[PDB]
Amino acid sequence: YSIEKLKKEENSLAKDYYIYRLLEKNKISKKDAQDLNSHIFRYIGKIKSELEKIIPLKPYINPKYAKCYTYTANTILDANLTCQSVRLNSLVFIASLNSKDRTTLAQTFKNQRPDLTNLLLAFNTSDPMSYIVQKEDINGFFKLYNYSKKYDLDLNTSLVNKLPNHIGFKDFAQNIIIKKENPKFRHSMLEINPENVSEDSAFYLGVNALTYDKTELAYDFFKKAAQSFKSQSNKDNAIFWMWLIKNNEEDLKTLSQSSSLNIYSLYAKELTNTPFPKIESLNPSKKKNNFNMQDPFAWQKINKQIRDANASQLDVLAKEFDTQETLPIYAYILERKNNFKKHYFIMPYYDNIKDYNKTRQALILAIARQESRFIPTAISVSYALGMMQFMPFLANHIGEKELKIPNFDQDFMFKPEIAYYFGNYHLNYLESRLKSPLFVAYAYNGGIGFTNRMLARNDMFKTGKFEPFLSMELVPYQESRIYGKKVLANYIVYRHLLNDSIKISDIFENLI
Numbered sequence: 337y338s339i340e341k342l343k344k345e346e347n348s349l350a351k352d353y354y355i356y357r358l359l360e361k362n363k364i365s366k367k368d369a370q371d372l373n374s375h376i377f378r379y380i381g382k383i384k385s386e387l388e389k390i391i392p393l394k395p396y397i398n399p400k401y402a403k404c405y406t407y408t409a410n411t412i413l414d415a416n417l418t419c420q421s422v423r424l425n426s427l428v429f430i431a432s433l434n435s436k437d438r439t440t441l442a443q444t445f446k447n448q449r450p451d452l453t454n455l456l457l458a459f460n461t462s463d464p465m466s467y468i469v470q471k472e473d474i475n476g477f478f479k480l481y482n483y484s485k486k487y488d489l490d491l492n493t494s495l496v497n498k499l500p501n502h503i504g505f506k507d508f509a510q511n512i513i514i515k516k517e518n519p520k521f522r523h524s525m526l527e528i529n530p531e532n533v534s535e536d537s538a539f540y541l542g543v544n545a546l547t548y549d550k551t552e553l554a555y556d557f558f559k560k561a562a563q564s565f566k567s568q569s570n571k572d573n574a575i576f577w578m579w580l581i582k583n584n585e586e587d588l589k590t591l592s593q594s595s596s597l598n599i600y601s602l603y604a605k606e607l608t609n610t611p612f613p614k615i616e617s618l619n620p621s622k623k624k625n626n627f628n629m630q631d632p633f634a635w636q637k638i639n640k641q642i643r644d645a646n647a648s649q650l651d652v653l654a655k656e657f658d659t660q661e662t663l664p665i666y667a668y669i670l671e672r673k674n675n676f677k678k679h680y681f682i683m684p685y686y687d688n689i690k691d692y693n694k695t696r697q698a699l700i701l702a703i704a705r706q707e708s709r710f711i712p713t714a715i716s717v718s719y720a721l722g723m724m725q726f727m728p729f730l731a732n733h734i735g736e737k738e739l740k741i742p743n744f745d746q747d748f749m750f751k752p753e754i755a756y757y758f759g760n761y762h763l764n765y766l767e768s769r770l771k772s773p774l775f776v777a778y779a780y781n782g783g784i785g786f787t788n789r790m791l792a793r794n795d796m797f798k799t800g801k802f803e804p805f806l807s808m809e810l811v812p813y814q815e816s817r818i819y820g821k822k823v824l825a826n827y828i829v830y831r832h833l834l835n836d837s838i839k840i841s842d843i844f845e846n847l848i
């Protein structure tokens with residue numbers, strides 16, 4: 337695809353991907369690059385840094401404030417009052433001022449902008465956090481935290497209970513808890529009233545309380561999370577913790593009857609001798625239609641349709657794609673048509689894996705389900721490719737250096753036989769070193785380096801009262817933490833569907 341051809345295509349991740357391929361091969365001239373950012377669907381990351389090597393972006397300073405950015409720390413007292421307050425939006429700018437000017441500016445702004453006054457006088461002390469905390473200036477607290485994660489201080493009950501009302505709180509709590517940073521902040525957060533938090537924040541505060549062995553406080557947080565979570569899967573995760581802590585058998589019963597299929601509801605069903613959940617059976621009689629399952633642009637276009645279709649238009653699409661060759665699109669449509677209440681666990685292109693042993697089949701299928709929902713031309717925001725979502729670098733290493741496939745191109749990852757074959761090859765590498773499918777999943781998504789570093793810690797996946805469940809909440813990258821839980825559930829299901837059942841209790845035992 338020439339850049340001219342691509343510019344005819346609708347903006348999409350597939351068009352971004354192929355523009356990116358031209359950039360990395362140095363095929364986009366400075367002239368081609370002029371109008372190019374209007375042709376880019378997601379102007380973030382590698383494509384943006386590659387385009388900017390060709391055409392740096394001067395943008396952007398709001399022309400209303402342009403003159404404000406002609407002052408420096410040395411001339412800010414010459415600026416009019418509007419420019420002074422605009423430049424004081426930056427804590428680095430405040431930090432660069434000399435202390436005499438911070439005092440002057442603090443008086444200037446005490447009436448109309450006491451938030452600025454607080455930060456200015458705070459930076460005249462040796463610990464701006466301590467000054468802002470004594471003022472209980474909540475906006476200033478989060479500005480300081482965003483400026484530097486190194487500040488750490490005990491926070492009293494009044495202060496910590498004000499923090500959750502600020503939009504920054506959820507990410508703040510999540511980061512310091514799963515990174516095990518800012519221990520004085522973490523310990524202080526034990527005194528947040530569960531009434532003042534909800535959803536993810538309540539849940540992480542439960543995890544925090546567990547790490548300090550405050551199990552009653554943890555129960556109260558997890559109960560509040562269970563009551564407020566929007567998604568049933570997260571609600572189940574919180575009810576599982578209520579059960580593990582206080583052992584109320586009504587909680588476990590509720591978990592076992594969940595409509596969400598996840599590791600917690602699966603485990604509760606196992607503990608209560610409840611039958612395995614119902615898995616839909618999709619077997620279209622019609623063998624084909626006209627859709628090219630190997631055209632990445634066609635997928636982007638039909639995906640946008642499906643995602644924007646009303647309840648009625650899904651019906652037309654479901655019928656059109658109810659074929660064997662478009663089985664992955666069919667199940668994709670059904671999963672939205674049925675408002676996510678039915679469990680679809682398809683096994684498309686099964687000939688390519690039927691000769692692997694059942695357990696390997698399930699791991700491959702479990703990864704593919706989470707990575708792509710089996711869409712052959714799937715492309716992630718980071719241009720991971722195909723059913724198994726291989727990054728181009730690893731795809732080329734395997735296909736060119738290891739397997740020496742003639743005329744290999746990274747787009748071969750869009751071919752199911754290649755995706756499954758490379759997936760098996762890489763999963764062999766990972767499983768040989770890590771054994772557990774959960775650890776393999778973490779390493780597949782996050783790399784074996786991060787996984788080895790996690791598993792080397794004294795406080796991860798070792799023996800313990802609430803292990804291995806607690807460790808699974810403390811996996812230090814959110815994407816991998818979530819990914820492992822989902823792939824593990826898929827793995828259990830596929831092993832069941834393949835007549836090679838394993839109890840998830842055995843899986844959890846082998847994590848320790």
Ligand SMILES: COC(=O)[C@@H](C)CO[C@@H]1O[C@H](CO)[C@@H](O)[C@H](O)[C@H]1NC(C)=O
Nearest residue numbers: 706707708709714715716717720725819
């Ligand atoms: C947008 O969401 C989807 O289409 C779902 C299939 C989930 O997306 C997948 O999420 C994984 C991490 O959990 C990434 O590793 C995958 O690359 C990523 N696939 C894609 C195609 O973006």
